[PDB]
């Protein structure tokens, strides 16, 4: 009940009832619990955390031997394991207890458990003044974490233009993958930024399919960022047949996950007219090997006629969108199945429940049958409804 009163009072940066309260014992033992748990953090994580300057300054002019002790922080709402103060004091965006920390000697390098390390943290909030501090102060542009998500591809998810823009001139490789094969490019493409996009092709980042298969075209197709698919269906490393996947499955997106079927349409005429716009070189429908009850047998509409009577068929348009998603997706993509048993929901609460079993049946079936070098998680099933690499 005495470590409890200096970690409270550390949390808390009330220094007065710290230095009275540590006069009383000497040297020996005021180091002895400054350096233990309450909960998995020590008095200093909890210090630098909070932005306690003066106090993280007073407990390192003492003892500071606890300066590398990762331990428990509270972030967002949540808790993260093993995390240094430096750690800490650069994902609050603490620049003064960042500083300090530095110059008492700690470790630029030290990472939480998931091996982010402070350069990563001041990425994610967007502390552009930290993030020139420790690269100015010998962090390492290419530690990821244990995902291999790089501190440049997470200021491109979170749109740090600045910061991206930052790290590029210090010479950060654009071309990094992560381990699923997620490139800077994707990070950009899934959270439509554009100008962060063009920004890294003035550096000759390369275009590349991920783990999935998918290039940040098709990444863009299906999150839905149009501004994405517009541009990179106009640039020049994209091919002819890439250019008209990447509308039909958007058009997909639109019909399931945007619920705008003239959007979606539109889409579908632009890439019907890019198949049919060269009579020398048709590019037609490839023809899956069989018909799928799921889809109520449907097949995909092959001319540019067929695409006028779908307007006023709202359920052919829905069975197009499948039929397109397991063509260009195929069926270990996780928004295959998923929008699967999104469509099967539709047509419970809409009576339809023939239909709705005979999706899910379906979506059961393609999960089971790609079982096993990627993940399967768990966290789109029907119990868990009612990305990792990109965390802090």
Known sequence: ???????????????????????????????????????????????????????????????????????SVNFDGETIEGAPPLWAASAAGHLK??????????????????????LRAACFDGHLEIVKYLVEHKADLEVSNRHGHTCLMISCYKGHKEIAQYLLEKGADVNRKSVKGN???????????LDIMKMLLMYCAKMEKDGYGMTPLLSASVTGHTNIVDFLTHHAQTSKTERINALELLGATFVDKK???????????????????????????????????????????????????????PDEMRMQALLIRERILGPSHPDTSYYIRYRGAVYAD???????????????????????????????????????GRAR
């Not at 490139?183 to 930024?193: F, K």
């Not at 079993?357 to 079982?371: C, E, G, H, T, V």
């Open 1 to 71: 009940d005495l470590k409890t009163a200096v970690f409270n009072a550390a949390r808390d940066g009330k220094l007065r009832l710290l230095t009275k309260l540590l006069a009383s014992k000497s040297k020996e033992e005021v180091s002895s619990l400054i350096s233990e748990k309450t909960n998995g953090a020590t008095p200093l994580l909890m210090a630098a955390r909070y932005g306690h300057l003066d106090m993280v300054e007073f407990l390192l002019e003492q003892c500071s031997a606890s300066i590398e002790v990762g331990g």
């Open 97 to 118: 207890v960042v500083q300090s920390l530095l110059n008492h000697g700690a470790s630029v390098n030290n990472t939480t458990l998931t091996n982010s390390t402070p």
């Open 183 to 193: 490139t800077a490019l994707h990070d950009c493409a899934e959270s439509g930024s």
């Open 259 to 313: 619920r705008d079927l003239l959007g979606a349409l539109k889409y579908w005429k632009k890439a019907m007219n890019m198949r049919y716009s060269d009579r020398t070189n048709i590019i037609s429908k490839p023809v899956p090997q069989t018909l799928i009850m799921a889809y109520d047998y449907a097949k995909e509409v092959n001319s540019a006629e067929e695409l006028e009577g779908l307007i006023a068929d």
């Open 350 to 388: 809409s009576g339809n429940f023939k239909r709705c079993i005979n999706l899910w049946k379906y979506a059961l079936d393609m999960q089971q049958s790609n079982l096993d070098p990627m993940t399967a998680s768990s966290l789109l099933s029907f119990a868990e409804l009612f990305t990792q």
